[PDB]
Amino acid sequence: VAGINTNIEFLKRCCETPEFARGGVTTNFISEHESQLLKSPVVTPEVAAMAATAWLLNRCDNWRGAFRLNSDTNATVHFYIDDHP
Amino acid sequence: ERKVEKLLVANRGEIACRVFRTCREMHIRTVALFCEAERNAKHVAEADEAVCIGPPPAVNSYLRGEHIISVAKQLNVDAIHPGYGFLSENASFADAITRSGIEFIGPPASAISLMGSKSESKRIMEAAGVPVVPGYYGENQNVSFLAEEAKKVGFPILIKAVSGGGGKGMKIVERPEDFTFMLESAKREATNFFKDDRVILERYVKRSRHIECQIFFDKHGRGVFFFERDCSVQRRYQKVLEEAPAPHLSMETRQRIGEVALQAAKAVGYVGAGTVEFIFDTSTGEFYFMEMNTRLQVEHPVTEEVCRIKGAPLDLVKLQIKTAMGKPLTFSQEDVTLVGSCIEARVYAESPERGFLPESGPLTFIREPFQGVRGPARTRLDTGFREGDNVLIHYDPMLAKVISWGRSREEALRGLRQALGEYKVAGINTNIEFLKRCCETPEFARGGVTTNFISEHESQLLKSPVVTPEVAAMAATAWLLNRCDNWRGAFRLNSDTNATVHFYIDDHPVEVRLHTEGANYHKIFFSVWDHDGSFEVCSGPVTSKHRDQKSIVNDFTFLFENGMHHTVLAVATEGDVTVIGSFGLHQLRLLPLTDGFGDSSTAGGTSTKIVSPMPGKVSKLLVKSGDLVEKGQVLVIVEAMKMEHPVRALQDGRVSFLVKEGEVVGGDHVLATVAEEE
Amino acid sequence: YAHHPIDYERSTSKSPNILRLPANTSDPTYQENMARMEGLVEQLRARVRYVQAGGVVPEEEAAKAGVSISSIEADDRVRKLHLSRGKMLARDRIERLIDPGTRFLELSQLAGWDLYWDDKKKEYERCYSGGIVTGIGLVNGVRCMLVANDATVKGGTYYPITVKKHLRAQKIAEQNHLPCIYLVDSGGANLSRQDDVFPDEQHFGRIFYNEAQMSIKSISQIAVVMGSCTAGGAYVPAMADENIIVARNGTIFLGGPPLVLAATGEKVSSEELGGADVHCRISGVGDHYATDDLHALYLARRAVANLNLKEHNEARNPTDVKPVPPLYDPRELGGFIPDMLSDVVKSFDVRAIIARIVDGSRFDEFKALYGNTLVCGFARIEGMQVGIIANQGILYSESALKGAHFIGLCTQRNVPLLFLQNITGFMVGKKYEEGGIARNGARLVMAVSSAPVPKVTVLIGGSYGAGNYGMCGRAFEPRFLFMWPNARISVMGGTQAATVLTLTNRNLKNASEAEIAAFKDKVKKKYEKEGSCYYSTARLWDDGVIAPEDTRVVVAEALRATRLAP
């Protein structure tokens, strides 16, 4: 789903690492493994490349028909990942 | 055991999609591989991730096994399936995979290396005790030795020679107690074909029919042979059509084929799926070993239609992954039972009229036969190409495979007929017409066909329907309308319209003329090959305004006066017009009319050519005398006050020089005569 | 005869004679040429970078440019001090101003390259640009001329090369009806070369003349006052449909802060003397008062929006078009160009160049068997029909007649013209002079000058002498000029002038070797001391300088620039 954050990543994390495939889980089973969970994949520097490129192209003709003299093109995108630009 | 979550594929094509599909059911990841470009291909649109490997030539792509292994290690791949071709048979690659720790799918490297050499393989089977027909026994040390072993080692007499296919020493001497003609035949063979004086004797078989049983093995010492197969039909060592249930094969024999096959595989040791091939003579009634392949065949889905395990559908590739899993089997040879019959045929992007030479071109329109169940038969199609794809010359010409499972042979054969007919491709000539001709007239519905079955009936085959004069009418009309508004809004005075099309059918130009009477675009006539009639035509929606290489694909309706009606989807281009309908498919080549339209000069060019001004001083002439000059190269360069002023003559024909470098020449001198090549 | 098509097929096929099929074979000759070209472009493409971010090149490996080493630290210090003020010291104002995803031209570049020689013998004045940067910009769907005053005031605001650049920009905008935007930052005037820049004509007064003649023709113009514009520079904010004064550092003065002293020297704050006075003063001077650089640029864009030119440009130049590329690779353009410094003229071709530049690699030849020297015909350049005159060899009377006929047709049907200059090539034979060659040359020049068609010229190479009068020249009103690196603009003879002037100059019969050393070598040094890089552009002779490979894009910019015209 795209548009709103969901807990779907949490549920998968609840299914892979916890060895509850055995079948024995208590009522408070969620409480102890909270450190293990709440974990998501790390955004690799490549992911920024496709994400950044899409915003331009999916907004305008950036890099389309562009032309300069005896030089080369340049265009930059700023992402506010976490609390660090 | 070792868990698997990532699957790697080596080759490309139908096998890529097949390996990818079942993978979804097992819930395993997938990885695709592709050459330069080759990224729009379907298989990559089916996997989870694809990697480009390099240049198109097979040396550059799919053969850098070390690079493939390093890439797989970087991806932390669990398993690799080589498929067939490329590194399918290479023990070094398998050993490197094993050292890297990835579960190779297939036989161990030792079996592949041993079967790589025919002599050591036949040695192994001879030691094992399997009936094997050898290629040689000793040499022609003595002529009496020939009579000694003629009635000894092999009663059937195969004289032949040490090498060479002439075989005039054979003389088809099937009669034993022959002693005055065999030596004379061998000595007359030695003349003009001396080669080496060593002569080898074998058993001679009058008839040959190919058999090939399938087998499967885990790594925990347990296996089960699948059902037999037949590959009697093959042209130039290329598989054409095959049948998993060998018609006319006794059950008891089936059983025994297994005991022999299992002995050989156990002797060499084997894991995974494989196939043993035999050679069989009906007159003798015995089978003799010819060869085995330690690799999954292309004919795997065929044998599947005639085998069920525990009443459930069988998946051959599934088990091979489960074999790689390390899990042991679940069934004995018994749980497997055959049910019904099936037939297969391969379609090749080649031209039957020509020397079966592959052709490369874009795929314009691809009809898809109904791949669903109906009546007493199951028909399926597997294709490694789709619409908008283009055939690569580097790869083999292979479009799709069609299989007709049925409860009885008849149902199966009949099913195919209709399916083979229904599937349609436009853009490249195919052998689909040949296969249908191979199925209708030949009375092979009986089930007895030899290895050389194709050779004798070549006169009967290679035959296609005759292009009726009507076919030209719909084909000619489509090219106009599917190009412009010909016959649309047309108008003249006190007269009637006329427009003509020239077809280059075979090596004879064909002219078709179309005209109208009245105020009717609808009422149209025709006159081709001195045959005249009337029809009406109603078109469809106008499509493909860009009229690119694919051009326009539209449906047409034609109501001829007699009373008929027709529907024709015509994709027409400048090169040809293709019409598909109940008649079949026919492409008519349009008479080519191109010849350097402009530069058509037959002038003699006798004198006064590339004349130089007064200063002269010719030098540095870079053209050879008596060499054709059509393009305007610098024939002579003369210098007048630092004026190179190259003449740059464009008169076609060879140029003859009458001057030499460094020679001062007068004004307007005849430096060379540019004359037509005579 | 067994041939009956309907013209197409013969046409609309990939086999029409209209196209061209000169395929190169990459031989030594090609290498010698192709390689040199490469040797003729690297620095061209490079100096650009050095003047860009002028005097601050952190790589310090700019040996590919013959530019002398300069004090990088001083320029970096100046830029740091200027950027600490709150204003962007760069061309950044421009690419912030123009819409993203659009094109730009940079009309005049490398302006004032090593022009003035200072008192220090080894030092030239460090004018990395002409003091301004000029290029055609597309703002808010509206094509406009952009002129930005650089913050380089170390030598003085404006030079004989600065006012000429500004006036060239104004003339181009008026001819093409592109509105102008001026980014104003000045140090006043230059009280050293003031006689050269202030009085006379075609000077600082003509700027004020043009800014009024434009508003007569209702071609709105906009100026942004980033810093002080004194010494007659304060009239542009006054003569402006819209003007912008930045809240803190935007200042406009008719008399300098030092000037109040020594004449009623009751000095007060520089704000009250005419700077940005945001206190609701009585003066209604300056339309926009913007708190920040981004705010000012944004208001400039907003004012540009409300001009109604978007509809007219969109109708005239189709925004949504399908690019048609040529049949041959544009990298091959450097190869067909011959080498340089060759005693005798080398060989050359044109067909290949036109087949490489035009759309679909096609051409429409007029008479080529006759007057085989000169080339003329129609073409296609990115959806627009074009006429090309490219010169090849020594001109004849018949070549002049053919040129006149072509120009007549082009003017008749309103087809733009493109020029590709070459040698003079006027024969001196007595029979040719007796054949009325002068009359035919006049026939050609009359048609060239009389043509109302828009005209652009680009130097191929070897444009020396009065021959350009036959084809085209700066003095014949070309709305744009661009140049290739291997260009020489000189007297009626590049090589022969040496031989001719050797004879008639106070030479004794003897001492022949010393004389040819003193005469021929010296005149060669004089006539190839001028070149594409220095004598041109730096002095705004043929202001544009380009690469041979990217010519079609530039010419397409030019043609789109010349269709807003009345």
Ligand SMILES: O=CCCCC[C@@H]1SC[C@@H]2NC(=O)N[C@@H]21
């Ligand atoms: O073929 C000999 C005639 C050479 C003509 C050279 C032309 S005439 C005008 C121009 N000025 C020169 O120095 N050379 C060219």
